[PDB]
Amino acid sequence: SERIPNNVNLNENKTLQRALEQWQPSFLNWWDDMGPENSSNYDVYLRTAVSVDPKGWADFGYVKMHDYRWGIFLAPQEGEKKITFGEHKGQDVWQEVPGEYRSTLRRIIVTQGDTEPASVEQQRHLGLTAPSLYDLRNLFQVNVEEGRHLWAMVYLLHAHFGRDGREEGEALLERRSGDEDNPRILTAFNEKTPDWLSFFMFTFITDRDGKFQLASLAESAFDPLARTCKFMLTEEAHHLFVGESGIARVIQRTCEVMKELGTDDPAKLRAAGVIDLPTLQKYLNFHYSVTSDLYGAEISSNAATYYTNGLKGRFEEEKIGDDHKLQNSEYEVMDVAGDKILTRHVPALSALNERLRDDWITDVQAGVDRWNRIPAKFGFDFRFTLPHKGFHRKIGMFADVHVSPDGRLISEAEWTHQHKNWLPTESDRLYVHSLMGRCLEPGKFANWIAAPARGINNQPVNFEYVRFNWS
C-alpha cells in the first residue's frame, strides 16, 4: 500500500501529492465528525477499490472506516480520444482545462463534489436504527464510496485548478448539510433523510440523478473529468442497487403480511408493523419530484453553452443518431398555457436539461416496473406509478403552479387540502419512524423489511457484516 492509492501516477508529481496529503487530515477530521455516528471502532466488511481492471478491481475485508483506503481511480486513458460533440467535435480531447472554460468547469466539479459529503452528512444517524447487519454494512459501503467521490473531485481541483482549486477543496469540508450559515449548495442535499425508507428512496432516485449527471460529464472534452466519472458510474451502480432492492424488500414484506392477514386495510397493516403500499407511494412521490428539480430549468441557455463548448454531453451521447451539434434539431417539452398543460417543440440546444430529466424518468420507471412484479406475483392489483413530471416542482416552468399526480393544474386551495394524499404527512413520518428499531443479530431482519435474495461477495446473509468489537 501507498498513502494515497491511485492509478494516476500520483507518485511522480510531488507537488500534487503533497497538496493532497495536506488535505487528507482535514478529510479525516470531517469523516470523524460527520461520518457514521459512533462507528470509529467498528470493523466493517467493506469493498475497497485498488484498481480498475473490469475482471477484478476491488478487495473485500474488514476495516475500521477511519482507516479506509480512499483513492483516486480514473478509467484508463484512450489513445487519440476525440471530442464527440459541440463546436469542438473532431478535435483532440483536453488534458488541461482551457482558460475560457476554467471557471465554468470548476463550478461544475465543485457542485458535483458538494453533493458527495452532503449525502454522508444526511445519512450519519441512520446506523443507530439499522434493520440488519446486512443493511448497516450497505449503508457504510455507500458512505465510504461517497467519501471516495469527494476525493475524486478534490483530486481534479488540486490537479487542474491551481490556487482556487486548493481553496475549493477546503470549502467542500466547511459546508454542512442543513446548516444555517454554510449549507450545501443544492436544496435536495440540505433535506433531512429521517428514516430508512427515505434512505432507500434516496439511493434509488437521487443517487440516480448522480448517475445521469456523471454520465453526461463522462462525455466531457475535459478528459480527466471524463475518466473520473466513467469510474464513478461503476460505484453509483451499487448505490442504485441498494435503493431499488431496499424498497423491493420492503414491498415484499408488506405483501407477505397482506396475504398472511388476508387484508388490504392500512390500519390493520400498520397494527402488524409494516409500511402500507400507499404510504410507500407517497414517499416515491416525494423523492421523485424533489430530485427532478436537480436537472434545472427545462429551457436554459447555460445548458446549451455547456454542450456547444464540449463541457457536458447528453446521456449516452455517442449512441444518439444525429449531428451532435444540434443547431438544427428540435426537442419536445411541456408548456403551461392558461389552464392547460400542452406540449411544444423548442431548439434541442435549449432543452438539454429536459432531455436528461426525460432519460432519468425512463430509468426510474424501469425500476418502478420491477417493483410492480412483486404485487403481481401475489395477485394484488396495487401498482406503483410516477406522478406527472410537473407535480411538486420548485424549479422550472412548473415552479409557480400546482399539478396533481395525474397531471391536472390545480388551485392553491386544492393543493393545500389534497396534498396529504400524495406526499408523506407528519403522521406518516411518525409512523414509519416508529418501526425503526435496530436489529444487529446476524441474519435477522426488522419486521418491516424482508431478507435480501443474497449476501455480499458470496458470503451468506447471516455473515457478521459488521463487528462492533464487543462481538
- Residues forming the site for ligand [O-] (CB under 6 A): 146, 149, 207, 210, 235-236, 239
CA–CA dist 125, 196 (Å, integer)? 10
35 binding partner (options ligand [O-], Fe ion, Cl ion, none; Cβ < 5 to 8 Å by kind): none
Q: Which is nearer to Fe ion, 88 or 239 (CB)?
A: 239
Q: Which does 428 bind (CB under 5 to 8 A by kind): ligand [O-], Cl ion, Fe ion, none?
A: none
Residue 41 interacts, among Cl ion, ligand [O-], Fe ion, none and using kind-specific CB cut-offs from 5 to 8 Å, with none
Q: Which of 311, 307, 295 is nearest to 363 (CA)?
A: 295
d(CA 266, CA 258): 10
- Residue 211 within binding range of Fe ion, rule CB under 5 A: no
State the sign of the Cα–Cα–Cα–Cα dihedral 302, 83, 162, 4: positive
332 forms beta bridges with: 345
Our CB check for Cl ion shows the closer of 253 and 388 to be 388
| Partners of 59 in beta bridges | 48
**Minimum CB distance to Fe ion, residue 70 (Å):** 13
Least distance in angstroms from the C-beta of 238 to ligand [O-]: 8
Nearer to ligand [O-] among residue 75 and residue 446 (C-beta): 75
State the minimum distance, in angstroms, from the CB of residue 412 to Cl ion: 4
Binding mask 400-429 for Cl ion (x = CB under 5 A): -----------xx-----------------
Least distance from ligand [O-] to the Cβ atom of residue 159, Å: 20
- Counting contacts by CB under 5 A, is residue 184 touching Fe ion? no
Sequence-ordered alpha helix ranges (H) in 263-344: 266-271, 277-292, 301-308
Neighbour-count burial of 174, counting CB atoms closer than 10 A to its CB (0-12 exposed, 13-18 middle, 19+ buried) = exposed
| Least gap, CB of 456 to Cl ion (angstroms) | 51
Q: Which residue in the block uniquely carries the three cell numbers 491511485?
A: 6
Contact 218, 230 (CB under 8 A): yes
Q: Which is nearer to Cl ion, 63 or 401 (CB)?
A: 401
| Choice between 181 and 412, CB closer to Cl ion | 412
359: partner contacted, choices Cl ion, Fe ion, ligand [O-], none (Cβ within 5-8 A by kind)? none
Rounded Cα–Cα distance for residues 261 and 276 (Å): 13
Count, residues near Cl ion per rule CB under 5 A: 2
Rounded Cα gap, residues 213 and 357, in angstroms: 10
Q: What is the Cα gyration radius of the chain?
A: 23
CB 21 → ligand [O-]: shortest distance, Å? 24
Residue 207 as a binder of Fe ion (CB under 5 A): the answer is yes
Sign of torsion over alpha carbons 68, 70, 75, 76: negative
Out of 137, 160, 208, 239, the only residue in the binding site for Fe ion (CB under 5 A) is: 239
Question: Interface residues for Fe ion in 90-119 (CB under 5 A)?
Answer: 116
Least distance (Å) between residue 403 CB and Cl ion: 12
Shortest reach from residue 120's CB to ligand [O-], in Å:
10
Of the candidates 88, 106, 148, 149, which one interacts with Fe ion according to CB under 5 A? 149
The CA distance from 31 to 146, in Å, is 11
Q: Which residue has the cell 423491493?
A: 248
State the nearest-atom distance from the C-beta of 322 to Fe ion, in Å.
Answer: 30
User: Which residue, 135 or 276, has its beta carbon nearer to Fe ion?
Assistant: 135
The residues, ordered by sequence, that sit 6+ positions from 366 with a Cβ below 8 Å of its Cβ are none
| φ, ψ at 6 (rounded to 5°) | -175, 160
Residue closer to ligand [O-] by CB (options 124, 149) is 149
C-alpha cell at 362: 425512463
Q: Which residues fall within 8 angstroms of residue 35, CB to CB, at 6 or more apart?
A: 65, 120, 124, 143, 147
Residues that bind Fe ion (CB under 5 A): 116, 146, 149, 207, 210, 239
Residue ranges binding Cl ion (CB under 5 A): 411-412
